[PDB]
Amino acid sequence: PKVATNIMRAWLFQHLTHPYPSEEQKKQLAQDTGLTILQVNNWFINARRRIVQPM
Ligand SMILES: [Cl-]
């Protein structure tokens, strides 16, 4: 699971100005992580919320 998380973190940091994977990108991320598309989407929702959450 560390590799799965690191796959998504790496994508996220490379796309900080638009941290919203397209449908095709979600599909590739699912393949790379071994997570479902649903899990990939939920991870990104939670990541974007974490970035903006108050100190
Ligand atoms: Cl990282």
From Swiss-Prot:
Look up the domain of life of the source: Eukaryota
Q: What are the TM regions of this chain, as residue ranges? A: none
Q: Where in the cell is it found?
A: Nucleus; Cytoplasm, Perinuclear region
Q: Where is this region: Interaction with DNA?
A: 16-50
Organs and tissues of expression: Expressed in various tissues. Expressed at high level in the lymphoid organs of hematopoietic tissues. Also expressed in some regions of the brain, such as the putamen.
Which residues lie in coiled coils? none
Instruction: Provide the residue ranges listed under DNA-binding region in this record.
Output: 1-55
Q: Which disease is it linked to?
A: Cleft palate, cardiac defects, and impaired intellectual development: An autosomal dominant disease characterized by multiple congenital malformations, mild-to-severe intellectual disability with poor speech, and delayed psychomotor development. Congenital malformations include heart defects, cleft lip/palate, distally-placed thumbs and toes, and cutaneous syndactyly between the second and third toes.
What does the record note on quaternary structure? Monomer and homodimer. Heterodimer with HOXB13. Isoform 2 interacts with TLX1. Isoform 3 interacts with HOXA13 and PBX1 isoform PBX1b. Isoform 4 interacts with SP1, SP3 and KLF4. Isoform 4 and isoform 5 interact with PBX1 isoform PBX1a; the interaction partially relieves MEIS2 autoinhibition. Isoform 3 also known as MEIS2b is part of a PDX1:PBX1b:Meis2B complex; Meis2B is recruited by PBX1b and can be replaced by isoform 4 in a small fraction of complexes. Can form trimeric complexes including HOXB8 and PBX2 or PBX3.
UniProt record similarity statement: Belongs to the TALE/MEIS homeobox family.
Q: What does this protein do?
A: Involved in transcriptional regulation. Binds to HOX or PBX proteins to form dimers, or to a DNA-bound dimer of PBX and HOX proteins and thought to have a role in stabilization of the homeoprotein-DNA complex. Isoform 3 is required for the activity of a PDX1:PBX1b:MEIS2b complex in pancreatic acinar cells involved in the transcriptional activation of the ELA1 enhancer; the complex binds to the enhancer B element and cooperates with the transcription factor 1 complex (PTF1) bound to the enhancer A element; MEIS2 is not involved in complex DNA-binding.
Q: What's the name of the protein?
A: Homeobox protein Meis2
What organism does the UniProt record list as the source?
Answer: Homo sapiens
Span of the full-length protein shown?
284 to 338 of 477
